[PDB]
Structures are given as C-alpha cells and as structure tokens.
Amino acid sequence: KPKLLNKFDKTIKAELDAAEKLRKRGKIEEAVNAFKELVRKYPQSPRARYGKAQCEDDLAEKRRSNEVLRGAIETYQEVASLPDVPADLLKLSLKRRSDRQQFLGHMRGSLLTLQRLVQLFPNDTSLKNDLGVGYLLIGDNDNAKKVYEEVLSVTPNDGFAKVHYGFILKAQNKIAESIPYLKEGIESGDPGTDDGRFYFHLGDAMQRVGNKEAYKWYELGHKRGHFASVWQRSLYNVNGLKAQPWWTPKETGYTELVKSLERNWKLIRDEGLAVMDKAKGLFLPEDENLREKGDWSQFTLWQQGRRNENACKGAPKTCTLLEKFPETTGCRRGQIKYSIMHPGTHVWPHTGPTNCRLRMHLGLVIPKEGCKIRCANETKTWEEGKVLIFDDSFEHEVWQDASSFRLIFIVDVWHPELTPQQRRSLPAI
C-alpha cells in the first residue's frame, strides 16, 4: 500500500529487500550492518537510511537503551533531509521520530517535528490532531485549542478533535460547553476517543451542572476497563491493590506514623498557626479547579517525595518528626502539607490520580460544627489530634460551613501492599 521507493531505490530493491528481511527475522545486529553498508554505498537512498533507523529502533527495544533510540531519532531526521524522498516514507519517518521523542520524554523536540509534519502535509487531519497532543504534553493548552478548532472547522465530525477540544474546555472551567464535545467525541468511536480521561472528565462536568446522567458514563468507563469501579476512578493504577474508601491505622500497618502524628499533634498545629500568622504567603490557594466556592489554601512540605527546604523553615520540628517515616517522605505519588479551609467552601466531588497512595488527615483546628468529608457513600468528620485515613482514588467531597477556619495536616503514604521495588520504580505523580 505505502510506496517507499523513489526512482533510484527501485534499482537497488534487491539489496534493500535482502537487508529488510534480516531485520524482520530479528537478526538486528546483521540488519544494522547491512543497512549501514547500503548507506555508505548509496548515501542518498531514503529507503537505505530508513532501514538503518528502523534497525536502530528495534535495537533499542532489544537492548532497552535510551541512547540507541536517541541515535535512531537522528537517523529518522536524516531520512527527511535526503533528496527525492517519497511522501509516504517522509511521513512514516518523521511520525516515528515524534512518537519516539515523546516516548523518551523529549516533548519540546517532538513538537518541532509535529509542526514540520503539518507544514509538509497541510491536508492531513490526523497530523494536526497529533500536533494538538504535542501541545498538550508541554502544557500549552492555548495552542492546542487553536489546533483542534482548526481541525473542527474543516472536519466538524472528527471525534478525536472533539474529545480533546472538550477536555481543553473543561480544564478552562467551561463546564457546560465541554459536555457536548466530550460526549459526542466518545460516542463517535473514532480511534483515540476510548480513553479513561474523557470518561472521567465528562462525568465530572455533568456532576457540576446537576446532570444525573454522569454516573452512566462512569459505569460505561468501568465497563470498558478504564475505572476499577464506579466509585474508584483513578487512572494511574497498580491493579490488585486492596480498594476501600476508609482505612483504620491497623489496616494500613503504619501504626507508628499515626502514633507520632497523634502524640505530637499540638506542635504540628502550632507550627502551622505560626506560618498562618507570620508567613501566610507560604499557604497557596488550591489551583486545580476543585472548588465550587470558598477559600482553600495549602502549605506543602513534601511533594513527589522531595522535601521543600524553604517550606520546612516554617515547620522545622514537624519536618524533623516526619524524616523518621520514609513511607510518607518517600511517597513520590503523594504530598505532605497543611490544608486550611474557611467557611462557605464546597469542594466538588472528585477523585485523585492514583490508587497507589492513602491519605492521612490529622485534625489541628476543627470547629465544632460545619466541617465534614464524604468518601464514597460515607461521611465523616475530623477531630483535633486524631487521624482519618481514606483512599482518595475513591470519589470524595468536602464542605466547610462553620464560623471559623479549619486546619488539618495531610500526610500521604504508599499503599501498604506496594512492594519496595514498586515504591522505587513507579513514576512520580
């Protein structure tokens, strides 16, 4: 189907085929040398250069080496620099370059390739969609939005562009506007639309507008293997981990951590209050669009398993106390932070990103009435000097209707059933 041979490459098809057959049989080492031989003999051959790249690519797989793949990335570029490159081969080479750049984490470099691909092929809609993804990976939602707007004006029915346009709208807090795009995009069934992210966000957007159809989408996402359950909708999961909304200290096995938090809770409180009084700028407003209303700020001591040295200046005894517990200071998928919430605050129902952590809440300043937290179908309250534990990968909701501020201390721990190797290898969140 795809024609990858220009006029000259057709005259050396036997040599090119002989080398390609070696690569297909997994004889990577022999195939690399064969294509290198063809590159020296035919330095202008696009197919010879592409074969060298593909062989380097397959070598990285067998070797599991980044550096081998990085070499293939340059060779894929070399193909596009050669003269008289067939269009199918040109697209295949630069697309695989982008895909491998993103695989390695080179998102900025993948963008340039994707911009070049769109310039070379202005009528290819799928490449524009791929360019939009390139923008979303570096955090450039403004440019990603334009790309999908450009696609939708030419192809209004493209489901991939729809879910991504809807996703961008929802991230911009345009909840009502995002629903038709997310819903029509998933319903389209186009490749790429069956993604847990769009199920997760479509149901959330519906909950925020009072649409009772939200949980139908949660059930469908669960039915298509994106969600472990209707109530537990995290997307970065290690399958098989015990899943329950609420945990007791015994069940977690972190009894020594809990004891230390409850026995020393007053010093933890006092250092938080001192920061409130004399260094309030260390408390930063929640910035994930999780509030319907109210005031909610957090003072973070650890994130992604990394201590914030300057932040710990404000709570030195607390940070020293926590250094003894690597189950939380080493939790690269959690944080340690003070959380202050004021009256008139409601936090939308929401789910955390991962099932690999449990959340400990130590009450520090808890008004008598007005403060409560629901996880799954069960609502509970904080207590000063006491620890609550819940799995925030389950839907949970919070209210603050007291007459003064509520201060808690939040300590994330690895899911107890995670092995040491898993705790060291899992990418940080």
Partner: peptide
C-alpha cells in the same frame, strides 16, 4: 502543572526512557 488532588492535566506522569 502537576496532579496533586485531581486529574486536571492531560498527563500526570513525566516519564523518560525505558
């Protein structure tokens, strides 16, 4: 842009390599 409490970002992990 990190996923602390929610799933607002397009990708929450920043993986690099094998």
């Amino acid at each position: 842009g990190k996923c602390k409490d929610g799933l607002g970002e397009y990708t929450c992990t920043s993986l690099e390599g094998f």
